[PDB]
Design a binder for this molecule. Structure first.
Ligand code: CLA
Ligand code: CLA
Ligand code: CLA
Ligand code: CLA
Ligand code: CLA
Ligand code: CLA
Ligand code: CLA
Ligand code: CLA
Ligand code: CLA
Ligand SMILES: CC1=C(/C=C/C(C)=C/C=C/C(C)=C/C=C/C=C(C)/C=C/C=C(C)/C=C/C2=C(C)CCCC2(C)C)C(C)(C)CCC1
Ligand code: SF4
Ligand SMILES: [Ca+2]
Lengths: 80, 39, 202, 74, 155, 143, 92, 147, 219, 146, 74
């Protein structure tokens, strides 16, 4: 599926986890920001690629990136 | 033929070569291609 | 299989030589299926039967003085209705042959009699000699068909002319086939190309 | 006997009518997106229509293709 | 008191039982048709399907065609139908050698839908068997349409 | 949550007329999902496949074909009726898999019980160029 | 109860809403006529070979297009032909 | 898991029609094929180059053959201003009575189409004057294409 | 010839602008700085940050193909009209009627197309009928390309989903099934197919008109 | 023991007084190590000479009785010009592919290839000005005369 | 016969326009591809390049496509 990455320039606002409609990203604790939490993506195989996380990212440049790749039945959004 | 042998073709040439490459050749080509596309 | 067609040619992997007439020549891999080659083999032998009978079928009438050298049905005693009874008797006979072949293979019998060894002869060498003579007649009947190039000349008559002049009475020059030279040219260079390809692809 | 005004009036009224029907198709979707509450419509015509939308669209799709072939292939 | 409801008491599926399908006249008639019959042998199924199709693929071909105005040739214009059913048998065999691939066997799901077994027509050899029956049936149906169109009497 | 609640059958499913958009041949040949929740009263919700259905009291269970449909119904019940749903993924063999919430708290919290994955300690823009990752099959972000 | 985990071959939609099972359709010995008739083409390679050899019918069929009298080989007509095409020149 | 995109396992593991279409798109992007080195890339390019040269020579050989079989080259040499060049013959079972009568131009026995490629003037300028020289040169070009 | 030469200069500088901009801004821009990490032909980078439709260098080349076709069409229209007026001894027609675009449309596209469309009428046909047929064939290919250029993938994805439901729940046709799931063409593929249809129609229509209008009234 | 070296000529071609900075240093390895650069250069040269062939064949006919054939000249000119246009678009396409796939900035630092990339906004903006000038005035003169 | 042909042409174009508009209205709420299309609004660009691409999936986009077909029909 698609490859999602979270860079260290994250501020931990927890907006990408709220914008993800397939429960791909999560918030793990961190010790490098004021909120002491950084996003992660354990369910990468469920990424569909709608890029809502990138629109929800407030920092410049985006801390989360969705690099599209190979497509499967789950990533193509097929219901049949 | 006569004094023209080098690539000189018989009269019923397009009557048997056009009915071949226009129907037999694309049919066998598409059949082999479909079997190769599938597993 | 040890003989081989041209000089030394790598016999095909599918042909292990189990078949009695495995000359090691089998180009484009037309037959490689286990259940398909047996049926093809049955076809080849049935062909030889009709062709051998055919070669000596035209040889007899041609040797003596008669009509039909090139065209049949000069007169005859049965018209059209004959042709219908021909297909009827053959359909019954052929259905029996197919049924017999399915049971044991190498169907050699007349009407409905699974094995036909009247003469009590059936050794291995005779099975092989059937094939080699059938292959030969299948290749000889085409020369009988090739009387078109030779026109009015018949099979025995074409031989007679070739005896009178052995250089100006052959397919290479006396016939209208100038491409026979190109056939023997590519048939002569093809072997070397196969050995060359296989050798290069080490 | 005034072909200019005849052709002009016909063409003008036809264009105004077509523009209005496309606008109707637009506002129906606007209503369905904003003012559609799935509480006052439990088993009515609107709920049943939205329930078999797949059957409706597939049939309209087939009719469209059939008319195109039989009306343009000629 | 509606004639429309879900199937088996579970509505989350796409197939919603409507009057057309629910209809007993439609239910029994579809089951009677030669394709939905599972116990009958595949060769038999293919022959019946091929007979009906080979017969219907002639008329619209013999009335509208390149030689539809030449009297005897018009009857001879029905041969194309034979060529058509030949192309149909070739593509049917092509679909069978690729639908149920050797790698993919049953393809899963035994299917309940009332006490009854999986149709053997979906096997690898079953589709070839069907292809055979369809070929003989189509060739025979086209030949019957051509024989019947000359001795039909007052057609 | 504190233990993965095992999905169990014989749960009262919501009253709903027969829809048309759901459970095709993939829901049987490959996989399908199922969402369970608890309702405190009787209300009418909107299914993400057609019309509206009601909420049967007690437990509730619904089945869908895509994970996005279950996630859409999950966020609708969490923001409009203040509920706490959970869905599973049923495979073809019958292997049930817990899916949300995996940690069981919520996916937008911390809980200090999960390890971060797919993170780059560098900032975007510090990635090396396409020329450097040649025939390596890897990419700048992957590196 | 609307979903089951073990008997999933009946709760998802795996049904046959138009198929009955019976060993009888056609009359006795009629099937036998069609069995022997369809035995030869029963295999995949057999039918593909049948239509491959029957594909040569188009080649042979075109040769016997004399009965059809298709415009193609009947003639091009010497009396009337477009050898006067264009007005600048008689031929070109 | 199918096996048509042999050069890409990613597209080979695609359960949709996207595998077919993309299988015909990235077929020449040797720089992004599964398990490809610089040496393998350069050698693959060197082979495709020879394939292109072979098809180019085969195409020009076919042009010489068609003009030598149906073109009125010998008739065009004796009068290069009035007569029109002939590309090849036209065999169409879909043609009607008036199509066969109207498609016959340039002094031919059957329907043909006039050539706009301008190869007649080129061959007449370089030296080709007979209908046999084009024949022997066409077989020579086919031979060099095979090599 | 002054104005037409300026039109040729305009087409050259515009095509060069699109291609040079797509080549220089290929590895990054201010709207997308990590573009080099996305490859050469990607659909977009979502509808965020205003929207990034047609942002790859492949998309830039795709947009430049239309300008290249327009520039070559202008230079060939100029060549064909100047030679079309020189060959018939009416060199004063183009010199006095080539200054206004209505003169271009009347004396070039409308006057020289009298014999092309008359290939097949209800009074029979002629040698030019094949050119007349391909002259309309090119128009049909062009119009089909406009479909892939205007309509985008999401509308078609929903349509294909409805057709899938139709084939699954239909009697006597549910026996067969697709080996690969049917899906709509991708965004990049849709741009490529539309461009191919646009270029093929643009080429076939002009080749038919050129050969027919020249062959029809000359040798 | 005779001849020239391409790398030596490229390294020696650097004007003093910092006109081009590093000059053509590293350009030999940049061109030889990349395939899209060579493909873009070859397509640019081929696309230019194809148009040259088209412009010289109609003015200076090289074949006998070619000026009399009016359809042949038109078809040949149109064919060669369209082929040249497609090849010219491919040259710039491969140049963009080169910049994305095989352009490492650390190898050729401060040379002409990395130097033209520093004022890409200036180059693109001036191209935009020229295109706007020609478009506005050619369209305006045509509409005024119309 | 020509009146028959043009009348069938008119019926075909009317069916395509009603297909585009009715699809937009019936799928403007929530489709099977994008289940949360109602919360996305009525006039939105797309839903990103996921699922292969979801450009013009909004109800407003269907009206834009419809306008084109109404022009082609009238
Ligand atoms: C690659 C260029 C080319 C093209 C575009 C065409 C196009 C056409 N040919 Mg032609 N042909 C060609 C080359 C070409 N031919 C060559 C090189 C030969 C000599 C072998 C022929 C011999 C030929 C004949 C005899 C006839 C045609 C005919 C036709 C027309 C009908 C379509 C058809 O039946 O295909 C053509 C069918 C073929 C079998 C020819 C294909 C040649 C293959 C590709 C090469 C065969 C190998 C050969 C032994 C040479 C070895 C070289 C090899 C190693 C590359 C069509 C306009 C028919 C026609 O109607 O005339 C108008 C017709 O009867 N062609
Ligand atoms: C590209 C090559 C090609 C060739 C060679 C042909 C050839 C032909 N086409 Mg055609 N066609 C083509 C492409 C081609 N087409 C394409 C690309 C299209 C799509 C636009 C069409 C669409 C098209 C249509 C709509 C029609 C044709 C028709 C025809 C036939 C002309 C009419 C006729 O005389 O009937 C043929 C008369 C015959 C006697 C031929 C009979 C021989 C056939 C081919 C085989 C039958 C033998 C049978 C299989 C025996 C089985 C043996 C058994 C023992 C097993 C003709 C043989 C017409 C037609 O089919 O006539 C009804 C017609 O209606 N074509
Ligand atoms: C809708 C468009 C259309 C239609 C209706 C026709 C119709 C016709 N064309 Mg044609 N054609 C078309 C488009 C069309 N064409 C296009 C676009 C081209 C260019 C590519 C051509 C090129 C072309 C050629 C070259 C020729 C024809 C010819 C013909 C005639 C005979 C062709 C034939 O094989 O018979 C029909 C064969 C069939 C198999 C028809 C099947 C009928 C189906 C099954 C409907 C009947 C059942 C229906 C589903 C009812 C349901 C029943 C229920 C129980 C389910 C025929 C009247 C031939 C002719 O000479 O004309 C007289 C001919 O030579 N056409
Ligand atoms: C009489 C004194 C003199 C003069 C006048 C020159 C002049 C020149 N030298 Mg030279 N040189 C000299 C002495 C001199 N040299 C001496 C004594 C030595 C030591 C022996 C050298 C050694 C030397 C070397 C080794 C080289 C030069 C080079 C050059 C040339 C380019 C220099 C430069 O900076 O590029 C120009 C500066 C720029 C910033 C380029 C500007 C680009 C413009 C703005 C682009 C605009 C394009 C636009 C689209 C135009 C529209 C027009 C339309 C038709 C398209 C230049 C013509 C270089 C060369 O050969 O290049 C040809 C080279 O490498 N010189
Ligand atoms: C020189 C030619 C030749 C040779 C050596 C053979 C040799 C053989 N044939 Mg044979 N055959 C031939 C020509 C030949 N045939 C011809 C011309 C026909 C056509 C009438 C037949 C038709 C034929 C039949 C029907 C049978 C044989 C069979 C046999 C096998 C045993 C019978 C026998 O000895 O004779 C022997 C294996 C029998 C067998 O079963 O083969 C194993 C078998 O019954 N042949
Ligand atoms: C009874 C008529 C009617 C009414 C009251 C409305 C009312 C409304 N429509 Mg609507 N609509 C209608 C008919 C109508 N429509 C028709 C006939 C169509 C089909 C074309 C549409 C299609 C349509 C769409 C697609 C949309 C609306 C939307 C809206 C809403 C906001 C529109 C807005 O903000 O205005 C803004 C005012 C303008 C944009 C000025 C219009 C400028 C036009 C485009 C220029 C026309 C050029 C002119 C004819 C010639 C000038 C030549 C030039 C040289 C000067 C609003 C409630 C929008 C919405 O979001 O709904 C909630 C929405 O996007 N409508
Ligand atoms: C000339 C250009 C063109 C063409 C041909 C089409 C064609 C089509 N469009 Mg379309 N469209 C276009 C431009 C075009 N569009 C543009 C510019 C836009 C932007 C506004 C759209 C927007 C649009 C939308 C939104 C929709 C369509 C839809 C459709 C399909 C409806 C099918 C139908 O009912 O009629 C019949 C179809 C045809 C007549 C196609 C032509 C086929 C001919 C007859 C060839 C016959 C086959 C031939 C003989 C075989 C060739 C043989 C060969 C393989 C060798 C149809 C195939 C609708 C759809 O998807 O269908 C439900 C749909 O919703 N279009
Ligand atoms: C010396 C010539 C040359 C060479 C060797 C290459 C080589 C390459 N190109 Mg390139 N290119 C060229 C010229 C060349 N190109 C030209 C002239 C253009 C301008 C048109 C382009 C524009 C271009 C782009 C935009 C891209 C490439 C890409 C690529 C790379 C892989 C894609 C590929 O080739 O797969 C093969 C591709 C196909 C098989 C598609 C074929 C479909 C064609 C285009 C349609 C045919 C038209 C129609 C069907 C004709 C039939 C008409 C009908 C009536 C019969 C590859 C290394 C791609 C890349 O870098 O990878 C991301 C990339 O995106 N090229
Ligand atoms: C960009 C393209 C373009 C150009 C270059 C022109 C040019 C011209 N047009 Mg035209 N036109 C165009 C587009 C264009 N047009 C278009 C697109 C249309 C369609 C809408 C028209 C429709 C049109 C019509 C209908 C007419 C013209 C006319 C004219 C002429 C008018 C001269 C004038 O205005 O008097 C003089 C204007 C002024 C003196 C303005 C005064 C400005 C200040 C006050 C003075 C400037 C300072 C002064 C010079 C002191 C400076 C000191 C300095 C020495 C230091 C002129 C040659 C007219 C004509 O006569 O045709 C020949 C006329 O009939 N045009
Ligand atoms: C002697 C003479 C003369 C002169 C001339 C001259 C001076 C020349 C020239 C010329 C020129 C001046 C030409 C050119 C052209 C060019 C082009 C056409 C271009 C290009 C480029 C490109 C296309 C690029 C690509 C790329 C990129 C994009 C980037 C980087 C990489 C690469 C490189 C790949 C005269 C006329 C006066 C007179 C006569 C004689
Ligand atoms: S190309 Fe499609 S998905 Fe990408 S930004 Fe544009 S509309 Fe959205
Ligand atoms: Ca000579």
């Amino acid at each position: 599926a698609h490859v999602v990455k979270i860079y260290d320039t994250c501020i931990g606002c927890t907006q990408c986890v709220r914008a993800c409609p397939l429960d791909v990203l999560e918030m793990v604790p961190w010790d490098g920001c004021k909120a002491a939490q950084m996003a992660s993506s354990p369910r990468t195989e469920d990424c569909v690629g709608c890029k809502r996380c990138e629109t929800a990212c407030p920092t410049d440049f985006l801390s989360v990136r969705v690099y599209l790749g190979n497509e499967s039945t789950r990533s193509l959004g097929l219901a049949y | 033929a006569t004094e023209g042998y080098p690539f000189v073709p018989p009269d019923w040439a397009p009557a048997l070569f056009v009915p071949l490459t226009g129907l037999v050749l694309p049919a066998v080509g598409m059949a082999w291609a479909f079997t190769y596309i599938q597993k | 299989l040890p003989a081989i067609p041209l000089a030394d040619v790598q016999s095909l992997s599918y042909l292990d030589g189990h078949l009695p007439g495995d000359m090691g020549f089998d180009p484009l891999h037309l037959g490689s299926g286990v259940l398909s080659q047996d049926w093809l083999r049955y076809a080849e032998v049935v062909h030889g039967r009709w062709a051998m009978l055919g070669v000596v079928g035209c040889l007899t009438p041609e040797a003596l003085a008669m009509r039909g050298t090139i065209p049949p049905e000069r007169g005859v005693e049965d018209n059209q209705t004959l042709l219908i009874i021909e297909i009827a008797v053959f359909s019954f006979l052929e259905s029996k042959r197919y049924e017999g072949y399915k049971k044991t293979g190498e169907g050699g019998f007349i009407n409905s009699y699974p094995f036909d060894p009247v003469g009590l002869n059936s050794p291995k060498h005779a099975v092989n000699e059937l094939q080699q003579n059938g292959r030969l007649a299948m290749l000889a009947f085409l020369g009988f068909a090739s009387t078109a190039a030779v026109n009015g000349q018949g099979p025995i008559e074409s031989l007679q002319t070739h005896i009178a002049d052995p250089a100006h009475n052959n397919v290479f020059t006396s016939s209208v086939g100038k491409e026979s030279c190109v056939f023997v040219a590519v048939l002569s260079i093809l072997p070397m190309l196969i050995e060359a390809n296989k050798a290069l692809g080490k | 006997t005034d072909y200019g005004t005849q052709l002009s009036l016909f063409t003008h009224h036809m264009w105004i009518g077509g523009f209005c029907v496309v606008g109707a198709g637009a506002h129906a979707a606007i209503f369905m997106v904003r003012d559609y509450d799935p509480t006052n419509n439990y088993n009515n015509l609107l709920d049943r229509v939205i329930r078999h939308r797949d059957a409706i669209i597939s049939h309209l799709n087939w009719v469209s293709i059939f008319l195109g072939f039989h009306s343009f292939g000629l | 008191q509606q004639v429309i409801q879900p199937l088996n008491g579970d509505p989350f599926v796409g197939m919603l039982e409507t009057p057309v399908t629910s209809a007993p006249i439609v239910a029994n008639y579809l089951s009677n048709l030669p394709a939905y019959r599972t116990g009958v042998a595949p060769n038999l199924r293919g022959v019946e399907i091929g007979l009906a199709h080979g017969f219907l693929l002639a008329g619209p071909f013999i009335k509208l065609g390149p030689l539809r105005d030449v009297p005897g040739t018009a009857e001879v214009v029905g041969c194309m139908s034979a060529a058509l059913v030949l192309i149909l048998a070739l593509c049917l065999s092509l679909y069978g050698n690729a639908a149920f691939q050797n790698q993919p066997s049953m393809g899963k799901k035994t299917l309940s839908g009332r006490p009854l077994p999986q149709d053997p027509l979906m096997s690898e050899e079953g589709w070839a068997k069907f292809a055979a029956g369809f070929t003989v049936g189509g060739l025979s149906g086209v030949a019957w349409a051509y024989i019947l169109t000359q001795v039909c009497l007052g057609r | 949550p504190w233990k993965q609640p095992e999905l169990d059958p014989d749960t009262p499913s919501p009253i709903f007329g027969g829809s048309t958009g759901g459970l095709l041949r993939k829901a049987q040949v490959e996989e399908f999902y199922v969402i369970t929740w608890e309702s405190p009263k009787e209300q009418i919700f909107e299914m993400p496949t057609g019309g509206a259905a009601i909420m049967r009291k007690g437990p509730n269970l619904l089945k869908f074909a895509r994970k996005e449909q279950c996630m859409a119904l999950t966020t609708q019940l969490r923001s409009k009726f203040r509920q706490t749903p959970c869905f599973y993924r049923v495979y073809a063999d019958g292997k049930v898999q817990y899916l949300h919430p995996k940690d069981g708290v919520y996916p937008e919290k911390v809980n200090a019980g999960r390890v971060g994955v797919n993170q780059n300690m560098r900032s975007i823009g510090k990635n090396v160029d396409p020329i450097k990752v040649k025939f390596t099959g890897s990419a700048p972000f992957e590196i | 109860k609307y979903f089951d985990v073990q008997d999933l071959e009946n709760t998802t939609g795996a049904w046959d809403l138009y198929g009955v099972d019976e060993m009888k359709r056609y009359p006795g010995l009629q099937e036998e006529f069609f069995q022997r008739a369809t035995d030869a083409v029963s295999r995949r390679e057999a039918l593909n070979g049948f239509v491959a050899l029957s594909a040569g019918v188009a080649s042979i069929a075109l040769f016997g297009k004399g009965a059809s009298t298709l415009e193609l080989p009947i003639g091009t007509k010497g009396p009337r032909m477009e050898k006067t095409e264009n007005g600048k020149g008689g031929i070109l | 898991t199918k096996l048509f995109p042999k050069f890409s396992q990613g597209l080979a593991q695609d359960p949709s029609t996207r595998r077919i279409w993309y299988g015909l798109a990235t077929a020449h992007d040797f720089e992004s094929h599964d398990g490809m080195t610089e040496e393998n890339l350069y050698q693959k390019i060197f082979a495709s180059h020879f394939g292109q040269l072979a098809i180019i020579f085969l195409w020009t050989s076919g042009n010489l053959f068609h003009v030598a079989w149906q073109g009125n080259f010998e008739q065009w040499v004796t009068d290069p201003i009035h007569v029109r060049p002939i590309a090849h013959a036209i065999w169409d079972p879909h043609f009607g009575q008036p199509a066969v009568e109207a498609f016959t131009r340039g002094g031919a026995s059957g329907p043909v189409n006039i050539a706009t490629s301008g190869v007649y003037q080129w061959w007449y300028t370089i030296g080709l004057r007979s209908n046999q020289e084009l024949y022997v040169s066409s077989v020579f070009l086919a031979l060099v294409s095979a090599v | 010839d002054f104005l037409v030469h300026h039109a040729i200069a305009l087409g050259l500088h515009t095509t060069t602008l699109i291609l040079v901009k797509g080549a220089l801004d290929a590895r990054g821009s201010k709207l997308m700085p990590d573009k080099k990490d996305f490859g050469y032909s990607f659909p977009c980078d979502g509808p965020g940050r205003g929207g990034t439709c047609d942002i790859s260098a492949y998309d830039a080349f795709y947009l430049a193909v239309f300008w290249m076709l327009n520039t070559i069409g202008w230079v060939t229209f100029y060549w064909h009209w100047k030679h079309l007026t020189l060959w018939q001894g009416n060199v004063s027609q183009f010199d006095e009627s080539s200054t206004y675009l209505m003169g271009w449309l009347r004396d070039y596209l409308w006057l020289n197309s009298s014999q092309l469309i008359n290939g097949y009428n209800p009074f029979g046909m002629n040698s030019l009928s094949v050119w007349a047929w391909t002259f309309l064939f090119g128009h049909l290919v062009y119009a089909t390309g406009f479909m892939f250029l205007i309509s985008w993938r999401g509308y078609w994805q929903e349509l294909i989903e409805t057709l899938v439901w139709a084939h699954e729940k239909t009697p006597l046709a549910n026996l067969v099934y697709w080996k690969d799931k049917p899906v709509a063409l991708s965004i990049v593929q849709a741009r490529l197919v539309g461009l191919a249809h646009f270029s093929v129609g643009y080429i076939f229509t002009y080749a038919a008109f050129l050969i027919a209008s020249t062959a029809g009234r000359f040798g | 023991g005779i001849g020239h070296r391409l790398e030596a000529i490229l390294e020696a071609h650097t004007p003093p007084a910092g006109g081009l900075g590093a000059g053509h240093k590293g350009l030999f390895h940049t061109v030889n190590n990349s395939l899209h650069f060579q493909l873009g250069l070859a397509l640019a040269s081929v696309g230019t000479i194809t148009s040259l062939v088209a412009q010289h064949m109609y003015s200076l006919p090289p074949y006998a009785y070619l000026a009399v054939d009016f359809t042949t000249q038109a078809s040949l000119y149109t064919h060669h010009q369209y082929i040249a246009g497609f090849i010219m678009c491919g040259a710039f396409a491969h140049g963009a592919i080169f910049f994305i796939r095989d352009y490492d900035p650390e190898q050729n630092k401060g040379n002409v290839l990395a130097r033209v990339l520093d004022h890409k906004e200036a180059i693109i903006s001036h191209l935009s000005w020229v295109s706007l000038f020609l478009g506005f005035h050619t369209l305006g003169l045509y509409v005024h005369n119309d | 016969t020509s009146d028959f042909l043009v009348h069938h042409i008119h019926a075909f174009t009317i069916h395509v326009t009603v297909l585009i508009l009715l699809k937009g209205v019936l799928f403007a709420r929530s489709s099977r591809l994008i289940p949360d299309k109602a919360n996305l609004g009525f006039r939105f660009p797309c839903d990103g390049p996921g699922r292969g691409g979801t450009c013009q999936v909004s109800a407003w986009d269907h009206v834009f496509l419809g306008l084109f077909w109404m022009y082609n029909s009238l």
